[PDB]
Structure formats: C-alpha cells, structure tokens
Design a protein around this ligand. Structure first.
Ligand SMILES: Cc1ccncc1NC(=O)[C@H](CO)c1cccc(Cl)c1
Ligand SMILES: Cc1ccncc1NC(=O)[C@H](CO)c1cccc(Cl)c1
Lengths: 304, 304
C-alpha cells in the first residue's frame, strides 16, 4: 500500500554520465559504448546563443577541443559529428558500465525518470511526464544540460530525453537521443511558444484506479457516463479527449478493481465539475496526471 | 527553475542490495563490507508473526539456513547475529560495490530517499519524510521488507532506514540500521497505534521559500507575525510549533530571498486560515512538508 511518484533506480544511467567541455562551456554527456552524446550548444558561447550557426561553429572545432571527463579520468576523442541538436563524440574506449539500452522517442503523456546532473555528476532523480505540449516540468539549473530522461524494462534502459533548454516560462525543452526536439523548440536564446497544454486524461483515470486500490474511494459515485458525454466535460476542463485506445490500456486496472472505465470517467467528471471539496486523493489536492496506466500496474504489482 | 520531489541517485545503494531467504521467507538485505543487514522477521513463518520469540526462532537457525544471493551469485554465510530487530549475516566476501557509508538515526521531519526493492532487485526510488509520529508514507508491498532509506553527502551514503512493516492503516514502520524501530512499533502482527501526526512546519516554510525562488509568489502578504502568535495558529492546525532552531535553519533561505522568517510565517498563517482559494504552489494544491531547508538549498543550488 501507498502510492508514490516513483522514479526508476538511476544506477545504470549514473554509470554513463560524463562531463563535456568545449571552449568555455561545460555540460553533461552520456557515454554509451564508444560514443558520448551531448547537446550541441556545448560549442557555443553566450554571444553565439542569440542565433547560432551550429554548422559554422562546429567547423572551428577539432576532436582535441572536446574535453570529456568520466569521473576523474579523461576520454580520448577520435571523432565528432552533429546529428540534429546533439553532438556524438566518438571516443577510443567503450564505457565498461554501458547498460543494455535503446534510444526511444516517447509520445506526449508518457512518463520517464530524469537523472539531473551538473558537471557530469548526478544530483538527483525524479519522475515526470512529457506534457501534451512537448515540454517537461522539470527541476534544472544552468549546467544541467545533457541530463537524460529514461525508462527501464528489466535490464534495458530506454533513453528518451536529453535536456537542452529552459523556456522563459520556466518549463523545460529537450530532444530525443537522435537530437530531435520534442515540440516546436529550436536551440536558440529566443522566446518560444510552448502552446496550450492539457491534462493527460488517461493518466488521471489510471491514478484514480491507483487511489481505489490503495483505499482512497470517497470519489466513487453512483453514476456512469459515455465517451461522448465525458469528452464534452474533458473539452470544458482542458483535458485530452479520451479514446477507445485509452479505455483499452485502462483494461488491466478496470479488471483488477471491477470498476468499469466509463464508471471511473463519471467519477472524474464529477471531480472536474465539483472539485475536491477540501479533500485529498493519494495525498494530493488536485487531479494527478503524471502516472500512466503502465506505471500504476508496475507500482501496484512491485515489478523490478 | 522548477522544483521537484527529488531523490538521491540510487546507484550506490543498488550495488548493496541482496536477496535473503530463510526457510520459506524471502526479503531484501543490505550488503556492506562483509556483513548483510536484513529485518529479523526473515526467520519467521506466518504463524510465528502473531507473537514471535525471535531469540528462540533464531536458535533453530544455522549459517547455512540463510541464503544470500547478490544478483545471481551466492554468498557464503560464516556468522549470524541479531542486533535489536535486524539480523547481521557475516559473509566470507566483502561487497566490492560497498560505497563510503555511515549508519545514522534521523530525526522526525528529516527526509530521505527509499530504494524500494523486491527479491533483492530495485524497483524504484522516491523521496519521503520521517513523519513526526515516526511512520513513513511510503509505497511498499509484501517482499519490500529490507528496502532502505538513505541520504548522500558527496561520496558517503548515510543509511537511516530499513523497511519492516505495514501498519493496518497502510502507513510504514521500520528501523535504523542498528535494528532500533523509529517510534513505538514492535515487529509483530498486531494492530499498533501510530499516534497523532503533525505537519512539519519548518519544511512547509522551506517549501514556501522554494516557491518564491521559482516564481510562485501569490501567497506573499503585507503582514508579519511573532513566534508566539504563529504557534497559536500552528497549534490550531496540527502543525509542529516553530522554535528559534527552526528559524536559524531557515536563515540561508531568508537571506537569499530577502523575506524575513516571521514574514514568511505570516504568509503561512494566512494560507492556513484561508486556504489556497483554488490556487497552487509549485504544482501542489496543499502545503507540502516533505522538503527540509537543506533540501531546498541543495535543489535550488544544484549540489552533486
Ligand atoms: C539556464 C538553464 C536552466 C535550466 N535548464 C537549462 C538551462 N539552459 C539554458 O537555457 C541555456 C543557457 O544557459 C540555453 C539557452 C538557449 C538555448 C539553449 Cl539550447 C540552451
Ligand atoms: C505486507 C507488507 C506490505 C508493505 N510493507 C511491508 C509488508 N510487510 C508486513 O507487514 C509483514 C508481513 O508481510 C510483517 C508483519 C508483521 C510484522 C512485521 Cl515486522 C512485518
């Protein structure tokens, strides 16, 4: 019992963190096999960040200009290349601590753990969601660039995010491990619109099932709804429209609790229309959307 | 910017987790140097847990009865002893992955990270507080016993908690690494009173300073208060009384923001008396008490 915003154990990722320095800029790198992945803005100075010509900036750099330190030992750089917004620094030694890994591009609404790092050293780990507007509400300061987001399946780390930038609104933007930004963002010091965010409806429903499993049941009502009726309410409250694909992923939780998905939607409809009335659900006074149905099943069953 | 319920990177602790089996019971162990630490209820069967005579139960066990597996390899047990509610299993090999470590008994109101484990394997990491009533609101299922709580200072892991038991209320009880329970709890299958909990006032104030630092300022008012006036309000709302020791630890945050501690107490007084009025602070609709002033300073400065 109990339900927490749990992150994956970060050990496999800690072993990949390195410090990358180029000129006067230092940020975090990810050492997997014989390649170091890091945000390409490592080659920029503050004056360059206004409107950087990354191709031109990288042309003035040689392998010896990229200083890569793993803990206290220095890595020899034998190749460099830019893929989208990431730099891939080929090194002469494969990381002995490389876990089994994949590079994945997550969908918005999916969750992942972030190992926040500074100067190649890990400071903390937290769970978060890729927002529907492709931003993340993280905790990052200057120097945290290159920190990565990931998921773990048994022994395989699926890297999904590399941190690049803080928007003027204090929300965070980044790329997949191929250097492609999530969302419309560009790696420049310019104000950029994140766009309208929504609440991740399937995740709130999953968290409501987690609450019922763990004893918080006060919000269960004598009502039911339909997908169309619920979606009218979701539209009014800036919630993502629920589809049959969402209903299908909630199947395991509906089977476990015996509460039909549309019955749980009617509880969520009443919570949206009436509020919490000063009450709480799983220690929260708002509807939590950072747990996927998969996360709820994993945490509620103790998957390692 | 951004403020998250961040846990320490769990890598150093993952490397210490082992599986301990005795008879039919399997739980988690902590392998540091040549000793495996685990909850003493590993020697019990379900029938024994009603009123166990641990001394008598352990007398029927020999070194060969404790099966300790680190990953996939088996550890040879050359000694066993009971210290309070923990068993210390001497093994013939020192853990090569033993980090620099200490055993500490935390004070209530202090926070720590938990690496939840099942069968010696890590499932997740989360940050939590030792409640004023010496319980923890964790996320643990059967088999999670032996999972540990810890803090990290540079390269040193300070183990503070070992998970033992789930109370009938769904809250969690455990011991320090010398086997001494936090609180009045005994390791028996009997209903046990946790006692009145309170909100950790110094932590809420620290989190209010974190909110101001990160931009959430709506709760700042034109008022001030005194320790005695604030404590009358704290008493009414089941908050711990604030002392000058608490004011002193909030000094760094008061200096950073320029908001006097008693001025921040007046904001907290008004939030307690008026509520949030449907608004949020750092993504929360309630007053958060799981961040110490130290945690706020660490997260807001990027300490690794
Ligand atoms: C300062 C900060 C805070 C949190 N997370 C990250 C950062 N990083 C930034 O915003 C840097 C400048 O430091 C940057 C500016 C413009 C474009 C890009 Cl790709 C990166
Ligand atoms: C079942 C569970 C769930 C979460 N965390 C832990 C557990 N553990 C327990 O309560 C076990 C029985 O499984 C136990 C019963 C009585 C005393 C003690 Cl010390 C331990």
């Amino acid at each position: 019992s109990g339900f927490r915003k749990m992150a994956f154990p970060s050990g496999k990722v800690e072993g990949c963190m390195v410090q990358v320095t180029c000129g006067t800029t230092t940020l975090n790198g990810l050492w997997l096999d014989d390649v170091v992945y890091c945000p390409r803005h490592v080659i920029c100075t503050s004056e360059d960040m206004l409107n950087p010509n990354y191709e031109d900036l990288l042309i003035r750099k040689s392998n010896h200009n990229f200083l890569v330190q793993a803990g206290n030992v220095q890595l020899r750089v034998i190749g460099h290349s830019m893929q989208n917004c990431v730099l891939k620094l080929k090194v002469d030694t494969a990381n002995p601590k490389t876990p089994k890994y994949k590079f994945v591009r997550i969908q918005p609404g999916q969750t992942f753990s972030v190992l926040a790092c500074y100067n190649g050293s890990p400071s903390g780990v937290y769970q978060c969601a890729m927002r529907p507007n492709f931003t993340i509400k993280g905790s990052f300061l200057n120097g945290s660039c290159g920190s990565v987001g990931f998921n773990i399946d048994y022994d395989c780390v699926s890297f999904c995010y590399m941190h690049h930038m803080e928007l003027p609104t204090g929300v965070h933007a980044g790329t997949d491990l191929e250097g492609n930004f999530y969302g419309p963002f560009v790696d420049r010091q310019t104000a950029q619109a994140a766009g309208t965010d929504t609440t991740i409806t399937v995740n709130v429903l999953a968290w409501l099932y987690a609450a019922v499993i763990n004893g918080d049941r006060w919000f269960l009502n004598r009502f039911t709804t339909t997908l169309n009726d619920f979606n009218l309410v979701a539209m009014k409250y800036n919630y993502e429209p629920l589809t049959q694909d969402h209903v299908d992923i909630l199947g395991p939780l509906s089977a476990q609790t015996g509460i039909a998905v549309l019955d749980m939607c009617a509880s969520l409809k009443e919570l949206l229309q009436n509020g919490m009335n000063g009450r709480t659900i799983l220690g929260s006074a708002l509807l939590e959307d950072e747990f996927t149905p998969f996360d709820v099943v994993r945490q509620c069953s103790g998957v390692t």
